Design an enzyme around this catalytic site. Structure first.
Site, short mmCIF file in Angstrom:
data_model
loop_
_atom_site.label_atom_id
_atom_site.label_comp_id
_atom_site.label_asym_id
_atom_site.label_seq_id
_atom_site.Cartn_x
_atom_site.Cartn_y
_atom_site.Cartn_z
N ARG A 88 -1.51 -31.23 -6.82
CA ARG A 88 -1.20 -31.93 -5.59
C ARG A 88 -1.63 -33.39 -5.71
NH1 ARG A 88 -4.34 -30.93 -2.03
NH2 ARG A 88 -5.90 -29.54 -2.97
N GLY A 89 -1.13 -34.20 -4.78
CA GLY A 89 -1.42 -35.62 -4.77
C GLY A 89 -2.75 -35.94 -4.12
N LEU A 90 -2.83 -37.13 -3.52
CA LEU A 90 -4.02 -37.64 -2.84
C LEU A 90 -5.23 -37.74 -3.77
CD1 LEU A 90 -3.81 -35.87 0.63
CD2 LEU A 90 -2.92 -38.10 -0.02
N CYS A 91 -5.00 -37.83 -5.08
CA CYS A 91 -6.10 -37.97 -6.02
C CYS A 91 -6.49 -39.42 -6.25
CB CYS A 91 -5.73 -37.33 -7.36
SG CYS A 91 -5.02 -35.68 -7.23
N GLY A 92 -5.56 -40.35 -6.04
CA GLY A 92 -5.84 -41.75 -6.30
C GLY A 92 -5.09 -42.24 -7.52
#
Lengths: 97, 234
Positions: A88-92
């Site tokens: 998933r995203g939102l890791c930076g």
């Protein structure tokens, strides 16, 4: 001045965003701690495997094509790559890096 | 000016701060005992604006090319005086304090600035296409500002990232050193023809300059100046 009501609605939305991101940060810290515990639990097995492999590789010298997976095959023409990425995203910048 | 207009001579009319005209009218109306309208303005604001502005129009005998300045009280574009001015124009330019504080000193807001002759038949097909694509990219950037503010650039899609980078380069590229502004910016004044402006922005939108960092688009002329600066930095 758009409106008092509209700016108040925006304030509520950004406050909800802040709460959601705070919860995400907390659960991400908890998951990071659990993943670190898993890494430290896996580490002794990898250490023993590495030590056994080091002993075995020091034992064998100049074998028939130096084994199969250990073979230093010259004239490299095809390389396979195992890249690991988050689901998933939102890791930076991690996925981009 | 109407004397020279009526005898056929072209006239370049610069009226600085029409809002000062309006404010003087408002103070006089307050002293005249009229009942105020909206934020202390005269009841006859529209008719006074029509009386001044309709004499500015160019006619068949002669032409007046007017370039007015309009002060905006505080930063409220919804003030009655600029709002009454807005409908009396063939071209509107909006100057924003946020752009000026960001050191883009020709602080024209491209999304809030319009013109009547921005038509493919009047100004050209390529000029119209380039201007509309620039405005579309800047509008996409304005829509994604809230995303970029808190999540950052990394969450956007690849097309959105490219659009935002192009929009930032476009925002920096609109800044231009002026001949009368050599005291503030230590750069010589730069004159860019409309054809060179269109070609440079078409090249910026096509993909050229994507490798160039943003800071090389600040206070330059056409795209050749940006390329020369980037090659000098190398």
């Amino acid at each position: 001045m758009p409106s008092s009501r509209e700016i108040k609605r925006r304030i509520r939305s950004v406050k909800n965003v802040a709460q959601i991101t705070r919860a995400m940060e907390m659960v991400s810290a908890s998951k990071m701690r659990r993943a670190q515990r898993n890494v430290l639990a896996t580490r002794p097995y990898a250490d023993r495997m590495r030590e056994v492999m080091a002993n075995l590789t020091a034992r064998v010298v100049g074998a028939a094509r130096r084994g199969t997976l250990l073979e230093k095959r010259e004239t490299v023409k095809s390389v396979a790559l195992l890249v690991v990425t988050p689901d998933r995203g939102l890791c930076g910048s991690l996925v981009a890096n | 000016a109407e004397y020279f207009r009526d005898e056929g001579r072209d006239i370049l009319l610069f009226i600085d701060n029409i809002f000062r005209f309006v404010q003087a009218g408002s103070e006089v109306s307050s002293l005249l005992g009229r009942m105020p309208s909206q934020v202390g303005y005269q009841p006859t604001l529209g008719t006074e604006m029509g009386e001044l502005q309709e004499r500015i129009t160019s006619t068949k005998r002669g032409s007046i090319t007017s370039m007015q300045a309009v002060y905006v009280p505080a930063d409220d574009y919804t003030d009655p005086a600029p709002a009454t001015v807005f409908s009396h124009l063939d071209a509107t330019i909006s100057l924003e304090r946020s752009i000026a504080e960001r050191a883009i000193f020709p602080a024209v807001d491209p999304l809030a600035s319009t013109s009547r002759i921005l038509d493919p038949n009047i100004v050209g097909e390529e000029h119209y296409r380039v201007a509309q694509e620039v405005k579309r990219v800047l509008q996409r950037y304005k829509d994604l500002k809230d995303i970029i503010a808190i999540l950052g650039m990394e969450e956007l899609s690849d097309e959105d990232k490219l659009t935002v980078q192009r929009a930032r380069k476009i925002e920096l590229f609109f800044s231009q050193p002026f001949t009368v502004a050599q005291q503030f910016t230590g750069r010589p004044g730069k004159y860019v023809p409309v054809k060179k402006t269109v070609e440079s922005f078409a090249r910026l939108l096509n993909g050229e300059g994507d490798h160039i960092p943003e800071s090389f688009f600040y206070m330059q002329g056409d795209f050749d100046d940006v390329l020369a600066a980037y090659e000098a930095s190398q």
